[PDB]
Amino acid sequence: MQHLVLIGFMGSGKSSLAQELGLALKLEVLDTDMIISERVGLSVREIFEELGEDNFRMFEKNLIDELKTLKTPHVISTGGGIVMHENLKGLGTTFYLKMDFETLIKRLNQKERAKRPLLNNLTQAKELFEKRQALYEKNASFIIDARGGLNNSLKQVLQFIALQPSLS
Ligand SMILES: Nc1ccc2c(O)c(/N=N/c3ccc4c(O)cc(S(=O)(=O)O)cc4c3)c(S(=O)(=O)O)cc2c1
């Protein structure tokens, strides 16, 4: 329970907020997708295609284990699915970057939707969104409204840390 872990959907801007936060609080910033992708020598798309989702999820689960040994606190941005690992419990204080369905759908591109059929019909897209939101909300210490831009998300994270310094 040492780090500030940002969770949420693709496109909620976790990374960007993570970096800002690193600067703000004088802390190192890590990114789970970047770690795994720089290791394997492939992008994340390329991993799922070349290696399979199961294999990525194993890298991911393993990587959580590693990060729980870091000594100093860091700000960690995480991939969308990371919240599926029981393992993630104990890594740190999770903040959900809450973004709305409409804007998250608009933020996806063609390559993203090309390979995931659930994103292409309304009904399933919403159903997916609802069940995974509930999973981010379950697993979150703080919910952050990301709809107001990065600065406003940053102001909320800092509010909470101002109030409970045991966090950082
Ligand atoms: N509570 C949960 C549980 C599972 C999630 C989850 O599995 C996610 N992403 N999943 C996939 C699965 C297959 C993919 C696939 O086969 C290709 C690509 S890609 O070409 O765009 O890189 C991305 C893929 C993302 C995302 S979330 O959408 O990442 O938020 C969020 C999730 C949130």
Author numbering: 1 to 168
Paper excerpt:
SK catalyzes the specific phosphorylation of the 3-hydroxyl group of shikimic acid, using ATP as a co-substrate. The shikimate pathway is comprised of seven enzymatic components that convert erythrose 4-phosphate and phosphoenolpyruvate into chorismate, for subsequent synthesis of aromatic compounds. SKs belong to a class of P-loop kinases that share a homologous α-β-α fold. Overall, these structures have a characteristic α-β-α fold that consists of the CORE domain (residues 1–31, 61–108, and 124–162), the SB domain (residues 32–60), and the LID region (residues 109–123) in the monomer.
We also determined the X-ray structure of the E114A mutant SK-inhibitor complex using a selective inhibitor (NSC162535; IC50 = 4.9 µM) identified from virtual docking analysis. After extensive trials, only the map of the E114A·162535 crystal showed a large piece of residual density in the binding pocket, which could be modeled as NSC162535. The final E114A·162535 crystal structure shows a trimeric assembly (R = 21.8%, Rfree = 26.2%). NSC162535, which is clearly observed in two of the three subunits, exhibits an extended conformation between LID and SB. Interestingly, it extends out to the entrance of the binding pocket. The LID loop of HpSK accommodates the inhibitor by undergoing a large conformational switch, distinct from that of HpSK·SO4 and HpSK• S3P•ADP. Notably, the side chain of R116 at LID forms hydrogen bonds with an SO4 group and packs against one of the naphthalene moieties with an electron-rich π system. This naphthalene group also packs against the aromatic ring of F48 from the SB domain on the other side, establishing strong cation-π and π-π interactions. The other naphthalene group interacts with the side chain of R132, yielding a cation-π interaction. Additionally, the guanidino groups of R116 and R57 are located near the diazo moiety of NSC162535, making cation-π interaction and a kind of polar interaction, respectively.
